[PDB]
Amino acid sequence: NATNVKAMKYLIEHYFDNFKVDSIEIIGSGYDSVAYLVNNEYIFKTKFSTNKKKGYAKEKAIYNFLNTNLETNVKIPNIEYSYISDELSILGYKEIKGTFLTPEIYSTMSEEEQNLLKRDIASFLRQMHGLDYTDISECTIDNKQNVLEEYILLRETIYNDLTDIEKDYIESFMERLNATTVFEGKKCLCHNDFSCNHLLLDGNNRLTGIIDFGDSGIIDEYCDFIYLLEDSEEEIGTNFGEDILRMYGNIDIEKAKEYQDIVEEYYPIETIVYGIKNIKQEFIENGRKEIYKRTYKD
Numbered sequence: 001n002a003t004n005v006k007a008m009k010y011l012i013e014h015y016f017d018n019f020k021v022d023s024i025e026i027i028g029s030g031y032d033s034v035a036y037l038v039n040n041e042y043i044f045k046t047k048f049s050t051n052k053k054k055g056y057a058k059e060k061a062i063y064n065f066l067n068t069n070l071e072t073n074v075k076i077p078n079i080e081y082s083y084i085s086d087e088l089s090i091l092g093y094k095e096i097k098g099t100f101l102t103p104e105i106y107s108t109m110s111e112e113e114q115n116l117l118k119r120d121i122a123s124f125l126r127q128m129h130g131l132d133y134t135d136i137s138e139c140t141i142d143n144k145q146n147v148l149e150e151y152i153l154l155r156e157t158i159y160n161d162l163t164d165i166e167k168d169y170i171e172s173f174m175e176r177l178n179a180t181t182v183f184e185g186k187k188c189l190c191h192n193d194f195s196c197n198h199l200l201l202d203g204n205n206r207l208t209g210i211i212d213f214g215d216s217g218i219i220d221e222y223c224d225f226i227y228l229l230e231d232s233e234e235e236i237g238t239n240f241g242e243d244i245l246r247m248y249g250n251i252d253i254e255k256a257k258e259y260q261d262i263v264e265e266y267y268p269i270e271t272i273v274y275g276i277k278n279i280k281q282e283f284i285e286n287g288r289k290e291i292y293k294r295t296y297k298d
């Protein structure tokens, strides 16, 4: 563990001239990134060359747009340090203090505390979804079209070596993709990874901050409800997302659920595709196995 930290301490001090690292520890990690807490005060998100090429660039542009344009008491990252190159990206900002929302914590809250948190969330999403996004119009994401392109990449690579059961799962998804209407609604700026491990609470169990707008863009309004609607051990549950949808208002709940259900069905294929693009066999295997788990669950 000691070695990662030394290397990143060196890089931080090297690229940010007057910055002195008195302490540094690993605070989280993704498949291709590592985040560090520095001087018990700064978060530094870091990445070495992936399929970002412009990964931390977009994320930084989104923080800069949001810090200019949001009116909210909810805190988000405000970038003070950035280094962006092809081979290395680093973003630093002051750590937002608080406690991440979990299902356990939620279950200890009174009904009223739960209501007020749901309202805070609905309010934040209403404010962000309502922004005029002209000044960030580069950050458009078309999920349907992305899936089509990923399907083509599958066809060009490993599709012919998949099993019949795997192929059928994929084709059955594509048929559903082609029949759905859930990509034809309102587009807006969405966080696009809006799960409870990105939501911070203050000492009264109210929403105090939101992190990791790394996947944000102009996309279907339904996107920001995918995790709030998810029924799993990591998320609070379907009722939570429904109530939030009612508070948010002017949105078709049944289509939001259809959108989540389609995204969930896509997951094993998304996983396979990630493995192909990043040359990681392990993801290809995991996604294929998951197709069997889902096929046999009923």
Ligand SMILES: NCC[C@H](O)C(=O)N[C@@H]1C[C@H](N)[C@@H](O[C@H]2O[C@H](CN)[C@@H](O)[C@H](O)[C@H]2O)[C@H](O)[C@H]1O[C@H]1O[C@H](CO)[C@@H](O)[C@H](N)[C@H]1O
Residues within 6 Å of the ligand: 029, 030, 031, 193, 215, 230, 232, 263, 264, 265, 267, 270, 274
């Ligand atoms: N950054 C590390 C965060 C941690 O690894 C994590 O929570 N990682 C995430 C764990 C989730 N169980 C995965 O699945 C999530 O999304 C699926 C659809 N996208 C849902 O059907 C699923 O029900 C949900 O659970 C999710 O895809 C993982 O997301 C991570 O990988 C995605 C690529 O697939 C990226 O796009 C995300 N930015 C990143 O958070």
Ligand SMILES: Nc1nc2c(ncn2[C@@H]2O[C@H](COP(=O)(O)OP(=O)(O)NP(=O)(O)O)[C@@H](O)[C@H]2O)c(=O)[nH]1
Residues within 6 Å of the ligand: 027, 028, 029, 030, 033, 035, 043, 045, 047, 094, 095, 096, 097, 098, 197, 198, 211, 212, 213, 214
């Ligand atoms: N308390 C607190 N924790 C934070 C803050 N920013 C980051 N973290 C912590 O660091 C972890 C990683 O941050 P995050 O932005 O989600 O990055 P990532 O998802 O691992 N990487 P990427 O977004 O490049 O794929 C978070 O899960 C959380 O543990 C912050 O402002 N406050």
Ligand SMILES: [Cl-]
Residues within 6 Å of the ligand: 281, 284, 285, 288
């Ligand atoms: Cl495999």
Ligand SMILES: [Mg+2]
Residues within 6 Å of the ligand: 198, 212
């Ligand atoms: Mg994250």
Ligand SMILES: [Mg+2]
Residues within 6 Å of the ligand: 193, 212, 213, 214, 215
């Ligand atoms: Mg992220």
